Write a protein that binds this ligand. Structure first.
Ligand code: CL
Ligand code: CL
Ligand code: CL
Length: 197
């Protein structure tokens, strides 16, 4: 009987009006914890807000698109819970207009495009971003952050920020987006399908 505890905690996000922002939250415990998102007590209820569960509901991503300011700007709360106890954590969302963006704000110079690979073959999704500091690429598949460790060898981010998928499988198929992040904020590239034939 271990109380819930967070293993990936959400971080404050600075997003652009008309784009996407995602908060990732996951916990562990015994019995296994269930996480959920809410805003200021009441639970998240909008047509532009989505919660994508994972890790048997012990993990949840909150995704907002399109981002709207000032309405979306809030503090969002992830709650992890099991039979032993409860624990909550939060993250703030800030949404800027394009004209409000600092020069160092992440920018997708070249987003990912259509890809069709045959299974067991290597696919490579390209992405070039820029900003100040140089932004870190985070790959998303179907609104969930791609997890290299769970791929066991096959999937890695290369030095160029591109995602390499070795020995492709049917599960690899889906919508991929490139997320460029830094201290000034977060930018999402347009989605790009990967197909496995
Ligand atoms: Cl590509
Ligand atoms: Cl190949
Ligand atoms: Cl080929």
């Amino acid at each position: 009987e271990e109380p819930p505890r967070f293993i990936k905690e959400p971080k404050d996000q600075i997003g652009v009006s008309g784009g996407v922002a995602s908060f990732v939250c996951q916990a562990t415990g015994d019995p296994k914890p269930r996480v959920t998102w809410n805003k200021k007590g009441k639970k998240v209820n909008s047509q532009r807000f989505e919660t994508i569960e994972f890790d048997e509901s012990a993990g949840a991503v909150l995704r907002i698109q399109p981002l709207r300011t000032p309405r979306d700007e809030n503090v969002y709360e992830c709650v992890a819970q099991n039979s032993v106890g409860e624990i909550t954590v939060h993250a703030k969302l800030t949404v800027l207009r394009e004209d409000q963006l600092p020069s160092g704000f992440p920018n997708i110079d070249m987003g990912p495009q259509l890809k069709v690979v045959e299974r067991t073959r290597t696919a490579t999704m390209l992405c070039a971003a820029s900003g100040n500091p140089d932004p870190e690429i985070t790959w998303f598949k179907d609104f969930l952050p791609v997890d290299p460790s769970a791929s066991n060898g096959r999937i890695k981010q290369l030095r160029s920020g591109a995602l390499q998928i070795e020995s492709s499988e049917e599960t690899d198929q889906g919508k991929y987006e490139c997320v460029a992040t830094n201290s000034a904020g977060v930018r999402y590239s347009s989605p790009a399908n990967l197909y496995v034939r």
